[PDB]
Design a binder for this molecule. Structure first.
Ligand SMILES: CCn1c(-c2cnc(C)nc2)nc2c(N[C@H]3CCN(C(=O)C4CC4)C3)ncnc21
Lengths: 169, 935
């Protein structure tokens, strides 16, 4: 007066034939999960690298903003001080050199912008990697339990280890 | 990139007048040369007259880990600096240069910028850094005042054998700077103080306690109250027969090396928590999401595991549920652990993710209010538990993209509540036989037995001190009355031996008072013995709950008193900085260490950069191996090493495998790469200060994970020490192997050796090979060397269950010594019991070429048996050590069944006589199976 029935076949060869199938399907799913988990870790490392590089872009720009603040404060004296004594060379050289600094910042802002786009793209990859992994875990786990139930059935029935080993191969 | 390119780069220069220059310079150009080129160009740009001279300014750049760096050493090449963008700013030289430079170099060295610790805005991080950095800085300053005797002990601690005939062979000695040398006689059992006095008699122009002996070509120093034979170098020289070359060094010269600067129990309301929301969940829209949750103290649960309703799958699921657990607030132990797992289930099983949380914080306070737990992905395993209580407490650092569970602990009182102090715990805590024979029987070898040990807990303290661990597990941690009674006993518990303390460091004993007691019993360790377990102790940090713990303090204490321990502590931590689970914890210890070790920091810097270049060099060889044949790739590998930035980086550094060994000058012609899936580089070295056989090699391996091999070599080394402690030298080769990075390490080349495949393949033949390497009289040494090693490596491989043994991963030295390599699989894996193995070809050599040589074969059987026996006596050491290695997350060492392999292989259940009788039957069937296999 007790019941439990996960095994579909009933003769020893048919069950052992199904043991080989479920084992082969399990190792194939295991390989597919392990392939994805490498991508997950690699993508996680790559995303961290990109996030540090964005901070490095921010910190460089910060240095260029400080150069502009100095240029504006520091130049104030000489532009006015050599307007009387008309050195319009000095002004034109300084302000063009400032325009040369400003123009370089816009290149660095662009390069930062291009990276933020890759990180947004790669963040979306990361989430699809995790989405794919989570739709494989049920199949993987169910295939592990089945493989084990079939082994248990055959062992109880008294099937020799050599016969089990050949099916798991 | 900077690592490879020999071209020029356009660099942005920011002058302190606001002026901006932009011109190309060489990547190989050093910063001193760039400053000259800058000053030559700035002439013809505005505001030049207002600048000071070049020596008034220092270049600043943004380095590879996103931090500003004052580039004070201007002999470095721009390629070596690796600025993020080629941007150099001139700033004022003055300021506190020492702190700024150390912080910079620490960031580049640990592979994590220190700003990232600040960014977290965590009091626990900030307090740890504050406390540990001061403690380390304090030990470093205290070290600096002490004498050259003490400092030589720190810097170059003694390398002695475990440990004796009184024979005499001659010694070569010299002084520093002189060409000439003086060979003279000396016994094996002389004390180094005597040896120096002998050498001091140069002519008779005309004191030995002003000197020490150095093994020339390496940082190894003979000193102290030990005979010449106990030292490794002299012992190595005497066994091989070589003449030891030493060097006298003055006490003044050793100083020249040194002088480089720098209430709650009232709250009987039940524990509950407010589940609110999930974020960034990535699941199949058809299923529905459940959050299972449970409270834990180590392994065992404190109450039943509550669950949530089936809310439908999305990125942003909402629950807003109260979850009420079957335990009071006061009933919670110190180390109570709330453990979550997000699942995906059919409405009416898929573990999505998990996260753990300590209820009390590092300052003893019971947490209150909202917490955003950033979860970890659940990976399915054979023992698929509901929750993961043995997983880490730390948050997932990928806060941008990783899923998270928003929760909220309730406000239990207007005043906050801490866990009570020790004295209040000790207060409510003071309060022949039939039972005596029962307890003896239980402890000399379950629910009935647990309640018995609990009542008799005081008689365990008095008469069974070594059974503390058992008494800890039987304690009911879910009732605070029981907890106090146990902790009361623990505070008056007698000091246990090292072996028992090693058991107490495991994840099963999470309480701080236990952890503190374990470390207390490990302070009696010596540096040599401590080094034998440094790998295991590092892995145990991954079970810690809080950052500031006694095990971190212990390891830092020992690392600052001993430079070798510091060296291998650094690399053990450094080589796992890529792992987000431990990156924060390990990063903070490395930081603390560096601040107490600014001298060794400069040595580790050089090593890190060699490893950095080798990585790039191996990547090139990997690519060219696919593109071109090997001989041309070997040449293109050499041209890349000839580059001055490469050559100087790869030259003149202490070896990471052994800091006493110097790697002076690369032998580019001798350098190559091995034919193997990961294409490991074979790099050869040479130093003119060294003597005979002073031509070291290293193997840089990138792609595979070498932690598995290190553990195996650690355990072979351990066996060799255990065997040497009973006067059995089995001539092992426990070669150097060190993981240094992300799937990256070094392996010590073993000179004068080849694989048994190669010896057999090239022109029965194994015995002929030894004849060529040991002619005439020498051949008998080779066979004994073979037999001793063959015995040790037969036992070693059997115990550890190391399969996949074959001709090309078994090697032999020209001395006759056999040794195994490439330990990728162990404990039966490829699982199943690996039999004991005797090879016919090895037995042929052992018997001196004969069919029957009983006298010899019997001795070999004796060596195998005596070896096997000695390891059984120390069996619990191997279990305890392996049990802590489960922390490391090695695939083949992950559970009790992998530990059970060692129990069965060492036959620890059976008696010594029973075990020896089974070992002989295994030995005998191995002998019988040896004949049938070769045919
Ligand atoms: C003991 C270090 N060690 C290893 C080794 C490699 N990997 C792993 C995981 N462990 C150990 N291998 C050797 C070794 N190999 C010979 C035969 C093939 N060889 C070449 O291909 C080189 C000349 C071009 C040299 N020789 C000496 N020590 C070695």
């Amino acid at each position: 007066y007790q019941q439990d029935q996960v095994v579909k076949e009933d003769n020893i060869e048919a069950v052992g034939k199904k043991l080989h199938e479920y084992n082969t399907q399990f190792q194939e799913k295991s390989r597919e999960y392990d392939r994805l988990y490498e991508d997950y870790t690699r993508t996680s490392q790559e995303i961290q690298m990109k996030r540090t590089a964005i901070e490095a872009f921010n910190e460089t720009i910060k240095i260029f903003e400080e150069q502009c603040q100095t240029q504006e404060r520091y130049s104030k004296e000489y532009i006015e001080k050599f307007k009387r004594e008309g050195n319009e060379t000095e002004i034109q050289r300084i302000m063009h050199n400032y325009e040369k600094l400003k123009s370089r910042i816009s290149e660095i802002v662009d390069s930062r912008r291009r990276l933020e786009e890759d990180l947004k793209k790669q963040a979306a990859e990361y989430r699809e990697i995790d989405k794919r992994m989570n739709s494989i875990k049920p199949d993987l786990i169910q295939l592990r339990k089945t493989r084990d139930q079939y082994l248990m059935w055959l062992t109880q029935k008294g099937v020799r280890q050599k016969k089990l080993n050949e099916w798991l191969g | 990139w900077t690592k490879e390119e020999n071209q020029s780069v356009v660099v942005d220069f920011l002058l302190p007048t606001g002026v901006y220059l932009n011109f190309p310079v060489s990547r190989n150009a050093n910063l001193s040369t760039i400053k000259q080129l800058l000053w030559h160009r700035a002439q013809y740009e505005p505001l030049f007259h207002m600048l000071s001279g070049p020596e008034a300014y220092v270049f600043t750049c943004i380095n590879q880990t996103a931090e500003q760096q004052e580039l004070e050493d201007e002999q470095r090449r721009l390629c070596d600096v690796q600025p993020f963008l080629p941007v150099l700013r001139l700033v004022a030289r003055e300021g506190d240069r020492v702190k700024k430079l150390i912080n910079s170099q620490i960031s580049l060295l640990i592979g994590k910028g220190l700003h990232e610790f600040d960014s977290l805005c965590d009091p626990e991080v900030n307090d740890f850094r504050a406390k540990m950095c001061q403690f380390c800085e304090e030990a470093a300053a205290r070290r600096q005042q002490l004498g050259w005797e003490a400092w030589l002990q720190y810097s170059f601690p003694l390398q002695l054998e475990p440990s004796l005939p009184n024979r005499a062979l001659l010694v070569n000695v010299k002084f520093e700077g002189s060409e000439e040398s003086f060979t003279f006689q000396v016994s094996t059992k002389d004390v180094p103080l005597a040896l120096m006095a002998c050498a001091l008699r140069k002519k008779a122009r005309q004191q030995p306690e002003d000197y020490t002996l150095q093994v020339n070509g390496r940082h190894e120093y003979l000193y102290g109250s030990y005979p010449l034979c106990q030292f490794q170098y002299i012992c190595s020289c005497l066994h091989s027969g070589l003449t030891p070359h030493l060097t006298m060094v003055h006490s003044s010269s050793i100083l020249a090396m040194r002088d480089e600067q720098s209430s709650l129990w009232s709250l009987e309301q039940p524990f509950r928590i407010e589940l609110i929301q999930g974020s960034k969940v990535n699941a199949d829209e058809r299923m529905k999401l459940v959050v299972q949750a449970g409270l834990f103290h180590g392994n065992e649960m404190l109450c039943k595991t509550v669950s949530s309703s089936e809310v439908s799958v999305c990125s942003e699921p909402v629950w807003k549920q109260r979850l009420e657990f079957d335990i009071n607030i006061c009933d919670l132990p110190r180390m109570a652990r709330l453990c979550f797992a997000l699942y995906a289930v059919i409405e009416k099983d898929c573990p999505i993710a998990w996260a753990n949380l300590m209820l009390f914080d590092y300052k003893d306070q019971l947490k209150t209010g909202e917490r955003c737990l950033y979860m970890w992905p659940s990976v399915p395993d054979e023992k698929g538990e509901l929750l993961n209580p043995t997983g880490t407490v730390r948050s997932n650092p990928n806060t941008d993209s990783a899923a998270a569970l928003l929760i909220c602990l309730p406000e239990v009182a207007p005043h906050p509540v801490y866990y009570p102090a020790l004295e209040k715990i000790l207060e409510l805590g003071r309060h022949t036989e039939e039972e005596q024979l029962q307890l003896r029987e239980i402890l000399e070898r379950y629910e009935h037995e647990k309640d018995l040990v609990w009542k008799l807990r005081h008689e365990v303290q008095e008469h069974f001190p070594e059974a503390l661990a058992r008494l800890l597990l039987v304690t009911k941690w879910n009732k605070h009355e029981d907890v106090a009674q146990m902790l009361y006993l623990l505070c008056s518990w007698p000091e246990l031996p090292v072996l028992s303390a090693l058991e107490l460091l495991d994840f099963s004993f999470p309480d701080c008072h236990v952890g503190s007691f374990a470390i207390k019993s490990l302070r009696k360790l010596t540096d040599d013995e401590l080094f034998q377990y440094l790998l295991q102790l590092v892995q145990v940090l991954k079970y810690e709950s809080y950052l500031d713990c006694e095990l971190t303090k212990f390891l830092l204490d020992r690392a600052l008193a001993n430079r070798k321990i510091g060296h291998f502590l650094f690399w053990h931590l450094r080589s796992e900085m890529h792992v987000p689970s431990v990156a924060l914890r390990f990063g903070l210890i490395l930081e603390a260490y560096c601040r107490g070790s600014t001298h060794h920091m400069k040595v580790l810097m050089k090593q890190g950069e060699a490893l950095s270049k080798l990585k790039a060099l191996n990547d090139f060889v990997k690519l060219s191996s696919q593109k071109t044949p090997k001989p041309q790739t070997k040449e293109l590998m050499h041209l890349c090493m000839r580059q001055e930035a490469y050559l100087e980086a790869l030259s003149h550094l202490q070896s990471p495998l052994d800091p006493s060994t110097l790697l002076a000058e690369v032998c580019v012609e001798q350098c190559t790469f091995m034919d193997s899936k990961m294409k490991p580089l074979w790099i050869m070295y040479s130093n003119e200060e060294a003597g005979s056989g002073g031509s070291v090699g290293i193997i840089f391996k990138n792609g595979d994970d070498l932690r598995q091999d290190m553990l195996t070599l650690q355990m072979i080394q351990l066996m060799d020490v255990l065997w040497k402690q009973e006067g059995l030298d089995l001539r092992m080769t426990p070669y150097g192997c060190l993981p240094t990075g992300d799937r990256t390490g070094l392996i010590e080349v073993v000179l004068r050796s080849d694989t048994i495949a190669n010896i057999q393949l090239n022109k029965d033949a194994l015995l002929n090979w030894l004849k060529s390497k040991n002619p005439g009289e020498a051949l008998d040494r080779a066979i004994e060397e073979f037999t001793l090693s063959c015995a040790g490596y037969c036992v070693a491989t059997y115990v550890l269950g190391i399969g996949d043994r074959h001709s090309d991963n078994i090697m032999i030295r020209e001395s006759g010594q056999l040794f195994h390599i490439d330990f990728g699989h162990f404990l039966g894996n490829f699982r199943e019991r690996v039999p004991f193995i005797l090879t016919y070809d090895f037995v042929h050599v052992i018997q001196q070429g004969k069919t029957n040589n009983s006298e010899k074969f019997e001795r070999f059987r004796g060596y195998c048996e005596r070896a096997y026996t000695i390891l059984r006596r120390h069996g619990l050491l191997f279990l305890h050590l392996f049990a802590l290695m489960r922390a490391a997350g090695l695939p083949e060492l992950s559970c009790s069944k992998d530990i059970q392999y060692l129990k069965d292989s060492l036959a620890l259940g059976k008696t010594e006589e029973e075990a020896l009788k089974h070992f002989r039957v295994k030995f005998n069937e191995a002998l019988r199976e040896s004949w049938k296999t070769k045919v």
